[PDB]
């Protein structure tokens, strides 16, 4: 055990994680190589630098007292360790839908601004990564205050979780389930980014005089950094600055204990009283868990950045990359039509599970992608060209029956091809889930890969139905809708 050996290992980790991508065909090998080095460092370290003697629930009364003294709502709910979601809020009285039941004044928040005014200030003013990335700044703000026994935010920090279910905590064999999916590339990136950032800041803290007064100067472990970035990614929020002219990132105590259910966003910032405010998403009877709607994120985003998979996520989606090929004889015209419509020539679009499967922007792209030369000219020239562009994203106004048949044929074939790039089938995934006993983290990975394929399969079916509908219109010579 010596600081010189850790210094050698973090320098090696920094060089490893600063190399360019080796190509997608070797990203798994790179991932396992980085994991091996991270685990060697982690085994030579002492876990979290600061731990607390009490149990998590021992500190919730201090959280309530502290939040109360600073103007937050503390009546009408209690914290309960639920099996499905972990700790959350439970109503102790009936709460009506749309009732303002939770509010948190700005003084309680941890923000990039409070990070700047903290012991981290001097190093923040020097390091270009901290100034550019408020989320990393929040993460170091958390660590510095965690290790400061007299911190104003100790009541909040002592009630935070000590572990998360972000992919940073997954075993190698749990991530292995995601081989061949879209999501695993984001898992790879998160792991490499996090390891690179840990090694970079480890060296920066050692060399920068502005870091001399930080507790991190005496102890800063990989576990510290993984915990801090996972705390921030699973709980951070965008709020306006005090003057309302800019946005900043913040952790919001007490309210961020609410778990997620489907619905609408009911939390907003009140500038006049300078506090976060939450109205009830639905009626909550006494004894019922209080939920909020986190946002319209996909299950890939919930797994990677929030650490959970949400069954019956009505906003689930997968990505699909499309572009006009520069070998297309009509490339120049198609690119100009797309540019006039505000759509890039190449982009990553979404396929949605809830109807409709494609957005107005993807419909517009696909229509132009399949246009004939005569149709392109009608979107480029003359007194109706602008009108024709205006309707490109509108399912009710096709370019022509032929254009629709072609684009839905294309999407059906592409979604089918994408399904064929996965290592397992939908039926195999359901069999794994039914016949094996798995961890929470393993189930998150398998449900994620199942969900990608189920969205693609629904897209194939919806494109096939649409192809048949427009082929009927074409064969019946139906008059084209005119806007």
């Amino acid at each position: 055990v010596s600081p010189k050996e850790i210094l050698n290992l973090t320098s090696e980790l920094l060089q490893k994680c600063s190399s360019p991508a080796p190509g997608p065909g070797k990203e798994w090998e790179e991932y396992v190589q980085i994991r091996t080095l991270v685990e060697k460092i982690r085994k030579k370290q002492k876990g979290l630098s600061v731990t607390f003697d009490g149990k998590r629930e021992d500190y919730f009364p201090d959280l309530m007292k502290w939040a109360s003294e600073n103007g937050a709502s503390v009546e009408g709910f209690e914290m309960v360790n639920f099996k499905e979601e972990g700790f959350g809020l439970r109503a102790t009285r009936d709460i009506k839908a749309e009732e303002l039941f939770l509010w948190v004044p700005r003084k309680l928040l941890m923000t990039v601004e409070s990070a700047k005014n903290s012991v981290l200030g001097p190093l923040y003013s020097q390091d270009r990564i901290l100034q550019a990335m408020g989320n990393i700044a929040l993460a170091f703000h958390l660590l510095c205050e965690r290790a400061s026994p007299n911190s104003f935010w100790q009541p909040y920090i002592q009630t935070l979780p000590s572990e998360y279910d972000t992919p940073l905590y997954f075993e190698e064999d749990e991530v292995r389930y995601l081989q061949s999916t879209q999501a695993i590339h984001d898992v790879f990136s998160q792991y490499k980014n996090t390891a690179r950032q840990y090694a970079y800041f480890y060296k920066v803290i050692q060399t920068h005089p502005h870091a001399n007064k930080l507790p991190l100067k005496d102890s800063f472990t990989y576990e510290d950094y993984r915990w801090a970035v996972s705390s921030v990614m699973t709980r951070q929020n965008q709020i306006p600055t005090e003057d309302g002219s800019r946005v900043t990132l913040a952790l919001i105590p007490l309210w961020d204990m609410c778990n997620h259910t489907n619905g609408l966003i009911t939390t907003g910032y009140n500038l006049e009283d300078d506090r976060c405010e939450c109205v009830a998403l639905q009626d909550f009877r006494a004894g019922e868990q209080i939920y909020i709607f986190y946002g319209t994120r996909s299950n890939a985003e919930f797994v990677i950045h929030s650490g959970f998979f949400f069954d019956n996520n009505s906003h689930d989606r997968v990505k699909i990359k499309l572009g006009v090929s520069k070998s297309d004889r009509l490339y120049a015209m198609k690119a100009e039509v797309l540019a006039r419509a505000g759509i890039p020539t190449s982009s990553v679009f979404a396929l949605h599970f809830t109807e409709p499967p494609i957005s107005a922007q993807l419909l517009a792209f696909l229509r132009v992608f399949c246009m004939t030369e005569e149709e392109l000219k009608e979107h480029l020239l003359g007194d109706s060209a602008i009108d024709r562009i205006f309707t490109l994203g509108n399912s009710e106004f096709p370019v022509s029956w032929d254009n629709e048949v072609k684009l839905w044929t294309f999407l059906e074939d592409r979604a089918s091809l994408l399904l064929k790039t996965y290592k397992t089938t939908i039926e195999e995934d359901k069999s794994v889930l039914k016949n094996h006993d798995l961890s929470v983290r393993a189930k998150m990975a398998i449900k994620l890969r199942l969900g990608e394929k189920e969205i693609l399969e629904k897209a194939v079916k919806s494109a096939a139905v649409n192809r048949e509908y427009y082929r009927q219109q074409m064969e019946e010579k139906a008059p084209l809708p005119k806007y």
């Binding site: 990614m233 929020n237 966003i265 907003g268 910032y269 946002g295 950045h305």
Partner: peptide
């Protein structure tokens, strides 16, 4: 409308 809706755990870039 909510003038400043708060998305819990809004995704940020860590690259």
């Amino acid at each position: 409308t909510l003038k400043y809706p708060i998305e819990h755990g809004i995704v940020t870039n860590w690259d």
